[PDB]
Amino acid sequence: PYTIELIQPEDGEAVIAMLKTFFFKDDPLNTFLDLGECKELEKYSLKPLPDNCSYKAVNKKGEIIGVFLNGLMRRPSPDDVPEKAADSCEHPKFKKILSLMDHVEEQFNIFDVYPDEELILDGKILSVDTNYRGLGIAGRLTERAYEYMRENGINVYHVLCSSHYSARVMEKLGFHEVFRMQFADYKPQGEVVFKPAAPHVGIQVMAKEV
Numbered sequence: 001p002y003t004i005e006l007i008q009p010e011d012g013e014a015v016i017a018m019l020k021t022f023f024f025k026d027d028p029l030n031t032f033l034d035l036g037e038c039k040e041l042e043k044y045s046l047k048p049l050p051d052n053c054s055y056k057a058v059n060k061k062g063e064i065i066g067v068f069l070n071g072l073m074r075r076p077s078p079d080d081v082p083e084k085a086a087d088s089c090e091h092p093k094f095k096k097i098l099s100l101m102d103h104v105e106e107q108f109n110i111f112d113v114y115p116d117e118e119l120i121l122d123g124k125i126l127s128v129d130t131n132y133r134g135l136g137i138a139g140r141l142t143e144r145a146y147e148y149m150r151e152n153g154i155n156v157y158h159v160l161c162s163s164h165y166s167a168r169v170m171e172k173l174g175f176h177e178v179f180r181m182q183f184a185d186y187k188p189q190g191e192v193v194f195k196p197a198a199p200h201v202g203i204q205v206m207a208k209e210v
């Protein structure tokens with residue numbers, strides 16, 4: 001038995017402890033790179049918390065067994081200066097992940113898909129404790145975000161998935177692909193950067209209109 005609760009920034013340490021145990025070690029990109037200690041990813045993960053739309057799954061003992069960290073994304077201003085997230089990163093392995101993210105954003109803008117939308121919910125970090133996987137926790141974390149969206153007049157939930165495996169979970173939850181890129185085709189400087197196992201395939205950006 002578990003609950004789904006809003007994460008407070010004072011939960012930051014417990015969220016990071018959980019992510020270090022699971023996500024830092026078992027997201028397909030993190031594990032491919034053997035990420036290790038990564039304070040930049042800790043910083044990245046804590047950033048969306050004050051947006052007040054991130055959720056934790058908590059077991060009967062009060063331990064965090066899952067999180068979905070979300071941030072609000074606003075349509076770029078007409079005079080927007082696009083910045084590469086990778087430019088502010090010192091960690092070489094995480095920089096590769098940020099560079100991949102920058103590349104996706106250079107190729108695909110979710111706001112082009114939804115010209116009328118000013119604000120979109122962005123699902124940034126999804127992680128469930130191994131012993132609690134396959135129980136629908138990812139779905140219940142996601143569903144709680146629908147409540148936030150309803151309350152705040154947000155229509156679109158956008159989630160960049162790091163593998164076809166997790167994209168399939170989002171499909172089950174009613175999301176559909178809006179962009180994809182195979183790892184085999186991601187060659188920023190002429191050569192492949194990510195070579196995880198074949199079934200991962202590549203990134204898929206998933207979206208749902210609620």
Ligand SMILES: CC(C)(COP(=O)(O)OP(=O)(O)OC[C@H]1O[C@@H](n2cnc3c(N)ncnc32)[C@H](O)[C@@H]1OP(=O)(O)O)[C@@H](O)C(=O)NCCC(=O)NCCS
Nearest residue numbers: 026027028126127128133134135136137138160161162166
């Ligand atoms: C992706 C992830 C959050 C899914 O969470 P979840 O709460 O287990 O989600 P679900 O319960 O819907 O299970 C998803 C699928 O995992 C598989 N599964 C079943 N039992 C499982 C288990 N004990 N362990 C792992 N996977 C299992 C099933 O294929 C299941 O689909 P199905 O129940 O519809 O048949 C989780 O696997 C995870 O933390 N992965 C590592 C980090 C990651 O990749 N995050 C997403 C980045 S986009």
Ligand SMILES: CC(=O)NCCc1ccccc1
Nearest residue numbers: 027029123124125126160162
């Ligand atoms: C929804 C979700 O969890 N996307 C993960 C992207 C990602 C971010 C940082 C490191 C590795 C991978």
